[PDB]
Amino acid sequence: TVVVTTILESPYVMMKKNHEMLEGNERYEGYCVDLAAEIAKHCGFKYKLTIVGDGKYGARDADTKIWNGMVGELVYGKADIAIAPLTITLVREEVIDFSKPFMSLGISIMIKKGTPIESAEDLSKQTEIAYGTLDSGSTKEFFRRSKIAVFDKMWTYMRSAEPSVFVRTTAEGVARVRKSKGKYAYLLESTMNEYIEQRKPCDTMKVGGNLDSKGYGIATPKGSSLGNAVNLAVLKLSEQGLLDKLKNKWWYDKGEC
Amino acid sequence: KTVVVTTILESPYVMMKKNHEMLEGNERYEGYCVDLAAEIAKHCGFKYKLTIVGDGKYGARDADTKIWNGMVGELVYGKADIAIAPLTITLVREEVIDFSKPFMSLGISIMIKKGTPIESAEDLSKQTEIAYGTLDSGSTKEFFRRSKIAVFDKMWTYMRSAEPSVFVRTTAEGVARVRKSKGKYAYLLESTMNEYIEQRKPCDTMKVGGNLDSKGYGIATPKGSSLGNAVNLAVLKLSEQGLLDKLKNKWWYDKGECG
Ligand SMILES: O=c1[nH]c2cc(C(F)(F)F)c(N3CCOCC3)cc2n(CP(=O)(O)O)c1=O
Ligand SMILES: CC(C)S(=O)(=O)NC[C@@H](C)c1ccc(-c2ccc(C#N)cc2)cc1
Numbered sequence: 001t002v003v004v005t006t007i008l009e010s011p012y013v014m015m016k017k018n019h020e021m022l023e024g025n026e027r028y029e030g031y032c033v034d035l036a037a038e039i040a041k042h043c044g045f046k047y048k049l050t051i052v053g054d055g056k057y058g059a060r061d062a063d064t065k066i067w068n069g070m071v072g073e074l075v076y077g078k079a080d081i082a083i084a085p086l087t088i089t090l091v092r093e094e095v096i097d098f099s100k101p102f103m104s105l106g107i108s109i110m111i112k113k114g115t116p117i118e119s120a121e122d123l124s125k126q127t128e129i130a131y132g133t134l135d136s137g138s139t140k141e142f143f144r145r146s147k148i149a150v151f152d153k154m155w156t157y158m159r160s161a162e163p164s165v166f167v168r169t170t171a172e173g174v175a176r177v178r179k180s181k182g183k184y185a186y187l188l189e190s191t192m193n194e195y196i197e198q199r200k201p202c203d204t205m206k207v208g209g210n211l212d213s214k215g216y217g218i219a220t221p222k223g224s225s226l227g228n229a230v231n232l233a234v235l236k237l238s239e240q241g242l243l244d245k246l247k248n249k250w251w252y253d254k255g256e257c
Numbered sequence: 258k259t260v261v262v263t264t265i266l267e268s269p270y271v272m273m274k275k276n277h278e279m280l281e282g283n284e285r286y287e288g289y290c291v292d293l294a295a296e297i298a299k300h301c302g303f304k305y306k307l308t309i310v311g312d313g314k315y316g317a318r319d320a321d322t323k324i325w326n327g328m329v330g331e332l333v334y335g336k337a338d339i340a341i342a343p344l345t346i347t348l349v350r351e352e353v354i355d356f357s358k359p360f361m362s363l364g365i366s367i368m369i370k371k372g373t374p375i376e377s378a379e380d381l382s383k384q385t386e387i388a389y390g391t392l393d394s395g396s397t398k399e400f401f402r403r404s405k406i407a408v409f410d411k412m413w414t415y416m417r418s419a420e421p422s423v424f425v426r427t428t429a430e431g432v433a434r435v436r437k438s439k440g441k442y443a444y445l446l447e448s449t450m451n452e453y454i455e456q457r458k459p460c461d462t463m464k465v466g467g468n469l470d471s472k473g474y475g476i477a478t479p480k481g482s483s484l485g486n487a488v489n490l491a492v493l494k495l496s497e498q499g500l501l502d503k504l505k506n507k508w509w510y511d512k513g514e515c516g
């Protein structure tokens with residue numbers, strides 16, 4: 001049985017409202033739950049979905065040097081595959097493998113409606129409105145490493161801001177936007193931002209274009225016997241239209257806003 | 258050893274400079290993929306020679322002979338070390354060569370003559386006054402032939418049965434058809450080429466609607482080549498540093514003719 005690490009992040013993996021009456025994989029629903037089923041079918045394996053123990057995507061701890069989150073679960077042999085909104089990055093590709101992308105995204109800005117910010121440059125040129133990112137993910141590392149003038153200015157501020165502008169979970173960042181009376185903006189991936197913007201309480205907005213352009217991939221440990229097959233499966237699902245079918249299903253706008 | 262790069266003359270990826278007769282070797286060429294090749298080579302620490310694929314093809318396997326043509330063939334049969342071109346990452350190609358993570362995103366898109374009352378594939382599908390079509394052979398046609406989506410299947414049925422033929426042999430013919438048809442022909446093609454042509458004089462074409470699918474172009478190496486890892490890491494670095502975005506802007510918009 002293949003151990004699949006993943007993360008509770010809507011609409012990728014979500015606990016069903018009736019999860020108590022259910023066991024195993026049937027406890028969960030979402031884009032990545034459907035994707036896991038399709039990959040497993042095409043690759044011919046049985047699997048168990050497991051939510052990442054520390055609730056993190058994955059970064060290499062600065063002093064400790066140890067990987068956390070889903071990345072760490074792969075690196076240290078606790079899981080066989082990650083099927084999640086896990087961003088393909090250079091530092092990760094040094095220690096794990098990724099399929100070609102199954103979904104596009106870029107870093108984006110979420111504000112509470114009415115916040116006088118329209119761009120990353122707007123954020124960088126002021127301090128009245130605080131802004132931050134998720135801990136232990138690709139967005140924070142993006143800002144840490146960027147030499148683009150605006151993004152570097154943003155990083156210089158975020159790293160030293162106090163109270164801390166970083167959050168432990170996407171939900172914490174979104175809640176902070178909603179409760180901060182326009183004084184906190186959140187930097188998060190466009191396909192989470194967009195999902196949230198279309199749903200009640202309809203009090204957030206995505207502003208400006210995306211800051212970058214990348215993708216999520218299915219990740220395996222180096223030398224995994226699954227790597228090649230999983231990549232070909234993603235490509236087949238892409239060419240079959242299945243990935244777009246799943247995206248359109250899970251991001252379907254029911255017109256709540 | 259000098260790395261043999263296979264590529265293709267496709268604008269704005271690779272083209273011969275106006276003064277190419279005064280120049281030699283790689284200096285003869287310019288474009289997005291010429292710039293990309295230099296950055297990849299710098300990061301990987303190799304010298305290289307740009308060579309143009311003999312048959313002018315990207316790469317497909319003949320059903321009868323089983324022979325791979327194009328740049329894919331050059332890699333498969335060990336004639337080139339790397340392909341640096343707008344080469345689409347596909348299942349059948351990934352089975353025989355290695356690809357880097359993609360350096361560019363693309364999808365099927367709609368080109369209209371400015372003024373045409375069409376904003377989407379669904380708009381096209383509902384009508385016949387504005388004819389529409391694509392290359393008579395290729396991935397866009399096959400997308401429509403396979404599609405289970407109602408709108409796209411209706412478009413396929415329309416295109417396959419339309420008289421006169423709504424298909425074209427080349428993009429040059431497709432674009433000329435859009436420009437000469439007074440708004441009565443729309444052309445379906447990859448977003449990247451649509452965006453490029455939107456920036457060419459006489460500035461009378463327009464990309465409309467969202468892309469209908471999602472794919473990527475990648476750098477390819479022979480399967481199991483030891484160059485593959487460094488190349489992939491170089492692509493990831495160039496992506497994260499914003500260099501790929503700079504290159505797209507340079508060749509599509511800074512050198513664009515339409516504002
Ligand atoms: O790997 C591939 N890369 C391709 C790259 C391009 C370009 F856009 F120019 F970069 C194009 N064009 C489509 C529009 O008309 C001009 C040429 C075709 C490509 N094809 C064949 P397709 O997939 O049948 O279209 C491939 O196979
Ligand atoms: C980390 C980066 C080098 S990357 O993200 O690997 N590639 C850089 C970008 C510009 C890109 C991003 C995404 C897709 C894509 C391809 C296919 C499907 C599907 N289905 C969805 C998205 C293509 C190119």
Ligand SMILES: N[C@@H](CCC(=O)O)C(=O)O
Pocket residue numbers: 057058085086087088134136137138139140187188189
């Ligand atoms: N997808 C990101 C998590 C979200 C973010 O960093 O904004 C990752 O893989 O790290």
